[PDB]
Amino acid sequence: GLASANVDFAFSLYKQLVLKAPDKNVIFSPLSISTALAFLSLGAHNTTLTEILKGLKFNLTETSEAEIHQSFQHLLRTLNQSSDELQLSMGNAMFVKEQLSLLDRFTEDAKRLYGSEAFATDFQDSAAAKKLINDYVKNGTRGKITDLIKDLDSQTMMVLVNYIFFKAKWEMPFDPQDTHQSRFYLSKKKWVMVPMMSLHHLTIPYFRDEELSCTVVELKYTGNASALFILPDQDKMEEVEAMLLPETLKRWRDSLEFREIGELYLPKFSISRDYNLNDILLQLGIEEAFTSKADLSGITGARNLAVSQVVHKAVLDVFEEGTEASRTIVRFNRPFLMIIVPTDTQNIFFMSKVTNPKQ
Amino acid sequence: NPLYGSRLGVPDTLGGDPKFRSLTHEDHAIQPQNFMPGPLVNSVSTKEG
Amino acid sequence: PQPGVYPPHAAGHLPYVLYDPTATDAKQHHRHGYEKPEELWTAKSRVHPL
Amino acid sequence: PQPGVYPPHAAGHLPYVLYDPTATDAKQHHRHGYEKPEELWTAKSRVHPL
Amino acid sequence: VDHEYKYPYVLGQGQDTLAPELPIWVYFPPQYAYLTVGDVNTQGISGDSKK
Amino acid sequence: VDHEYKYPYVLGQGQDTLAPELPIWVYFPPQYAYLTVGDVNTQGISGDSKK
Amino acid sequence: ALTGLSTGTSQNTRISLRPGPVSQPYHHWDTDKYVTGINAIS
Numbered sequence: 230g231l232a233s234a235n236v237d238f239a240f241s242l243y244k245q246l247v248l249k250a251p252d253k254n255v256i257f258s259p260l261s262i263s264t265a266l267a268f269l270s271l272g273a274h275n276t277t278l279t280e281i282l283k284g285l286k287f288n289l290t291e292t293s294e295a296e297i298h299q300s301f302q303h304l305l306r307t308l309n310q311s312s313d314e315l316q317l318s319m320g321n322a323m324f325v326k327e328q329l330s331l332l333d334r335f336t337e338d339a340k341r342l343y344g345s346e347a348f349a350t351d352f353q354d355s356a357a358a359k360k361l362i363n364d365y366v367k368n369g370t371r372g373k374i375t376d377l378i379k380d381l382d383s384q385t386m387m388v389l390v391n392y393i394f395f396k397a398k399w400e401m402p403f404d405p406q407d408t409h410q411s412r413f414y415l416s417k418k419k420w421v422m423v424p425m426m427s428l429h430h431l432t433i434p435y436f437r438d439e440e441l442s443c444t445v446v447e448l449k450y451t452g453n454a455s456a457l458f459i460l461p462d463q464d465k466m467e468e469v470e471a472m473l474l475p476e477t478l479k480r481w482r483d484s485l486e487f488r489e490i491g492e493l494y495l496p497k498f499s500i501s502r503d504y505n506l507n508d509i510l511l512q513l514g515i516e517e518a519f520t521s522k523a524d525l526s527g528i529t530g531a532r533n534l535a536v537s538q539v540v541h542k543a544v545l546d547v548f549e550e551g552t553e554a555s556r557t558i559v560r561f562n563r564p565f566l567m568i569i570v571p572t573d574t575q576n577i578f579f580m581s582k583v584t585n586p587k588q
Numbered sequence: 589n590p591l592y593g594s595r596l597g598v599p600d601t602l603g604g605d606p607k608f609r610s611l612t613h614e615d616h617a618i619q620p621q622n623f624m625p626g627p628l629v630n631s632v633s634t635k636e637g
Numbered sequence: 638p639q640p641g642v643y644p645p646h647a648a649g650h651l652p653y654v655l656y657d658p659t660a661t662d663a664k665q666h667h668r669h670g671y672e673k674p675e676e677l678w679t680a681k682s683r684v685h686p687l
Numbered sequence: 688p689q690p691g692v693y694p695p696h697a698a699g700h701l702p703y704v705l706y707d708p709t710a711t712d713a714k715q716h717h718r719h720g721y722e723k724p725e726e727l728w729t730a731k732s733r734v735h736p737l
Numbered sequence: 738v739d740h741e742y743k744y745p746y747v748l749g750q751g752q753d754t755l756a757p758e759l760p761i762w763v764y765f766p767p768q769y770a771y772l773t774v775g776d777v778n779t780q781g782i783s784g785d786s787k788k
Numbered sequence: 789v790d791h792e793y794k795y796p797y798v799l800g801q802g803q804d805t806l807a808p809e810l811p812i813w814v815y816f817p818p819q820y821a822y823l824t825v826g827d828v829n830t831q832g833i834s835g836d837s838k839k
Numbered sequence: 840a841l842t843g844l845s846t847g848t849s850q851n852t853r854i855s856l857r858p859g860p861v862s863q864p865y866h867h868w869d870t871d872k873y874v875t876g877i878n879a880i881s
Binding site for chain 1: 830832834835
């Protein structure tokens, strides 16, 4: 039951995202936000837990928070059990005010279960706090993510960091020698020169949704996951988004039949954006933790801590051979959706809306 | 001018999306030419025949 | 009507105008707000019969 | 450069141009190949300081 | 009379549109038509193309 | 001298750019700047807009 | 090494003839593609 609520929360979060930016490129990992939100819940008490679990569509009458955690930890264990062919590295964490002593029990629990590590942070002289947090996030990853935090206010109380990066190879890798410079149409008469990679004489899961006015194709990775590319027709993206629901995603996944597509064209883009989730989570349904009344007793036990900044950066690469590259015609020269899901179960690893691959 | 490179660029990586690299003063063999050489019709020596 | 004489397109935002790269989300920050078109301004936009 | 004098946009394909509606992708075949722009051709494209 | 050559010129392309070679025959002048440039678009799934 | 009014006119707006009121003071002419039209673009999530 | 139209006494000893004659292009836009010639100067 965790996966369905994960997908619902993902869709609500994406809807809020587009509401804050109708045409800008959208990229975020629902899995990363899910683990960050659950880990924040790990340190909550009283009605803050109830609100943070009203978020992500959780029926507390049937599902208890301990079992939610255990399912999350099992998900992380399975993800880390994967071999080198596909890897998804997640490193979200929490930076606590150093003037308040952090709970040793909470740090041990986070390290053992959610694997996140927290420490006292010298938030005094926030200019140096920016430097130290950027240095930590750069040392954590291999170098995929830098300048994650744009700014820090004076006497910022605590900050939540969430980063993520995929690394997987296509089942049908694109040919770099066939990557052609073409046009991507922003609108009816607006286009940008962007490189697109091409395939031919290949069969993939494909579905033309005649009652939804879109086209869904599935590109499988060498691992147990895959990606779904969603191409609405001209001036029909908003209608697709409006009727875009998990009940739509289930029908799309169960209506994926193999088709011998003639040529497939896909923009060569590497989206990377940072997102501050204060207002967006406030509109989502989690609001008490942000107004100096979080009752975050699992963090220190003093109810002195509340969330001030939640910054998430989802970096994901779409090249010829996947990340860090060395009849029926499908051309993605229009703004399109992209949802990364497993074949076994429905759970959104990554979700993106691409409107300008030059950006 | 042998001392100065060209402001134009030449292909470095080939294929459908050719990246272009600028010219230095070391690579004189890739200097672009304003005018082409004259035609040659079987202009070969007696050692070929 | 004849085809419009379009101003040339740039890789990031617009060419030959001094903009603020921080305001834009484009990735051509190296030019520091003043950009060149990625296609050389070629003219020959208006067409006539043979 | 001054803003280009864009010919106005039609609801489907291009305005003031006779074309084959069957060769188009849009369902705006009701005007039978000849169309007028959805936005009235307004001019005032080039701008000057005040 | 297109003195300014403002319209496409289709004479002299070897078309079966000439005046009759015998004076005893009646000329039926050909209907004027011309070819122009355009954008080639593929007809979606069917794979056909049209300018 | 902008005789043809080619450049934007910023005089006559009540700005603190005036010459000194007494002849015993040195005038520091203001730096020229103007405001022009543009497209309002949102800065990501925050909703802040820049022209 | 050297690519495109070139003239010389051997493969190693050549001079490039880029961008070629003015009678031919070295970059344009195809039906759905930007095509760049091997004798293109940027």
